[PDB]
Structure formats: C-alpha cells, structure tokens
Write an enzyme that holds these catalytic residues in place. Sequence first.
Site, mmCIF file in Angstrom:
data_model
loop_
_atom_site.group_PDB
_atom_site.id
_atom_site.type_symbol
_atom_site.label_atom_id
_atom_site.label_comp_id
_atom_site.label_asym_id
_atom_site.label_seq_id
_atom_site.Cartn_x
_atom_site.Cartn_y
_atom_site.Cartn_z
ATOM 1 N N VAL A 27 0.884 -1.148 0.000
ATOM 2 C CA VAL A 27 0.000 0.000 0.000
ATOM 3 C C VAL A 27 0.932 1.210 0.000
ATOM 4 C CG1 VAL A 27 -1.742 -1.339 1.260
ATOM 5 C CG2 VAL A 27 -0.292 0.267 2.520
ATOM 6 N N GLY A 28 2.092 1.018 -0.628
ATOM 7 C CA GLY A 28 3.211 1.948 -0.538
ATOM 8 C C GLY A 28 4.498 1.259 -0.983
ATOM 9 N N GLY A 29 9.625 6.253 4.035
ATOM 10 C CA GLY A 29 9.505 4.802 3.964
ATOM 11 C C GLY A 29 8.276 4.264 3.233
ATOM 12 N N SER A 30 8.392 3.029 2.747
ATOM 13 C CA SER A 30 7.313 2.348 2.015
ATOM 14 C C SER A 30 6.601 1.279 2.893
ATOM 15 C CB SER A 30 7.909 1.690 0.787
ATOM 16 O OG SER A 30 7.060 0.667 0.328
ATOM 17 N N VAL A 31 5.320 1.019 2.630
ATOM 18 C CA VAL A 31 4.519 0.146 3.509
ATOM 19 C C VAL A 31 3.856 -1.007 2.747
ATOM 20 C CG1 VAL A 31 2.535 0.153 5.127
ATOM 21 C CG2 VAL A 31 4.223 2.040 5.123
ATOM 22 N N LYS A 46 6.406 -1.332 7.559
ATOM 23 C CA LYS A 46 7.136 -0.216 6.964
ATOM 24 C C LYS A 46 8.651 -0.519 6.874
ATOM 25 C CE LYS A 46 6.975 4.932 7.623
ATOM 26 N NZ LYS A 46 7.913 5.815 8.421
ATOM 27 N N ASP A 156 1.131 8.827 13.952
ATOM 28 C CA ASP A 156 2.217 9.811 13.880
ATOM 29 C C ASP A 156 2.253 10.495 12.522
ATOM 30 O OD1 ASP A 156 5.108 7.431 13.375
ATOM 31 O OD2 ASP A 156 3.521 7.958 11.997
#
Length: 326
Positions: A27-28, A29-31, A46, A156
């Site tokens: 869904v994606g 730092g990258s995720v 992440k 955050d």
Amino acid sequence: ERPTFYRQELNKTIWEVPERYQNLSPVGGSVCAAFDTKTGLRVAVKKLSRPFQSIIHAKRTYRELRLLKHMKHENVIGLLDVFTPARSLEEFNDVYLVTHLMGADLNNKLTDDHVQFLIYQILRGLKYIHSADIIHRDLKPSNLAVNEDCELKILDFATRWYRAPEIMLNWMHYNQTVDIWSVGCIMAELLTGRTLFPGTDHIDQLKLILRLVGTPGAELLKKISSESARNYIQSLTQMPKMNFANVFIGANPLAVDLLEKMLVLDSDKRITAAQALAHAYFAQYHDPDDEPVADPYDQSSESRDLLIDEWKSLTYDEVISFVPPP
Ligand SMILES: CCCCCCCCO[C@@H]1O[C@H](CO)[C@@H](O)[C@H](O)[C@H]1O
C-alpha cells in the site's frame, strides 16, 4: 532465536522479513499490508527508506523508533515489532517497523453518540501523549485511524485547516493545547459534515478563524511580544465572537459548549485533554480510573549532535532491546 527470513521484490525494491509475515501487498519509507501468522493479525510493515543516509536521517530514524517504542496506549499507534535482517551492527543497514494494519481513517454525517465516542477516544489518546510531554502538532483526520467498531488510534504520520492559529503565525513556543484546537476543528466537521475553516491560504484561514472567534481581546494583546503582530492586530476592525449555537445548528448543546471551550484564541484558556474528558458531553464514556498516563518521554536525545555511526549504533541498540507487547 533469530527468526528465519525470506526475500522477495515488491514495488521496485527488495524485502527481507521474518517468515511469520505473509502475503505482503504494497500500500506503498514504504509500507506493505501483511498477515502476521503468529498473532492472527493483519499488520502494516514499513521498510524505512534511507534510514542512515546522513546525520539528520539517522537522527530522525532513532527518534521515530524511540517514540514508537514509548507509546503504549489503546488510542495511540504502537509498535508490534521492529526488526532488521542484519546479524550484527556491521551489517546493519535496514529497519522495518510493524504496526496494526488500520482499516480506515476519519477522512474516509454521524450520530451524536458516535461523534462522542470518536472525540472521547481522541482525547483519551491525547491525554496520554500530552502526559509524556509530547505535542502532536499535526492532528487531522488523516492521522486518525479507525477500525470496524469505531475504535480509534492517533497516528504519527499538507492541509492546514486543523492548525492552531499560533502555528500559522509562527509563534514558536507552543503549548500542548495546539492539539486541542485541532480536536475542536475535527469535532466541528464530524458534527456538520463540513470543514470548519477551509482557507485557501494561511491568511484566508486566519480571517475565517477570527470571524468565528472574534478578534483578540486586550487580555490576549498583553501576551503578544511581537511589536509588528500587535500593530497589525490593532489595525483590524473589531469583530465580536459569533454565537456558536448559530454555526452548529441543532447540535447537542453539550457539544456546542465543549466546542466553545476548545476553540479559544488564547491557548492558555483552552480546555486541556484531561479536563475535556470530564466534560458532561462524555458522560457515557468517561471513567477516570481508565484514562491512563505515560511516563515522560526523554527528548534530549535530540539536542545532541552526533556522528552518523553513533546514531546508527544507538538505533541498533533500540532494535535489539525491543520487547513485543505481551
Ligand atoms: C490574529 C490571531 C492571533 C492569534 C492569537 C494566538 C494566541 C495563542 O495563545 C497564546 O499562545 C502562546 C504559545 O503557547 C502563549 O505563550 C500565550 O500565553 C497565549 O496567549
């Protein structure tokens, strides 16, 4: 000890994670979304991008990881796991963080009981965050995740519609009630289905605010050390504080009252998170024995000027000493 790791290539880079984590989908730092086979949870993993590329990246990496490890509360994002495929400090280049995969956010019109419950949880989380001497400073619908059952966590993680006026005047010196302003803007939008202060730029935004709350009173003018700010504010046509009942037509009178206490220009007179929780608007949810607080978070680790390798080692130490939530 030490999990077995497996490798794969996702969204234009490599991912080495423990076997427990399956079915990684960007869904994606990258995720990536993942299924954590140990706990039966769906999780967000992440991979930090460039965590130690410079002093400032490395220092940011350390700070983020320390903060996420300190947060242990139901309405605040927490750390489920942190790991690195590195076997030693000498190999240490990559950091992965694991949290609850949150379904939606509050950006994704409500009943009053429901508005009550969401704002209650925001405030319960914020009490905790503030008790750690942390100010969030960017509370907004996109930083508030919700699951199925309306259970909420503060994230955050730009729009400026939720920003306290003092931040847009570049006040510096911010009180934690900057966040209470944001909550008031969020609550207002949950009540009406519209953005309270949809300014096209910072100045337009401040005109919208003043129109509701009115121009600064002599009491607030006494606390403004900036000579030019003072001169400008005095030049303004004095406008009175609108009556909030007429902006929030039909809302629960208790909601309107809490809004009046949050959306005050003078940050010293805003209600605090702890006070707000005891407001009659939340009578059905409030329990003073179940609104926990945090230990003070040490942020000194942050006025320091260290070498990259020092920030990297301090980060490695924090990875190794991590204890997962029981
Ligand atoms: C034209 C709009 C004016 C905005 C007035 C903002 C007043 C904010 O409130 C202030 O913020 C400070 C920072 O926490 C404090 O030091 C003050 O005691 C307080 O008055």
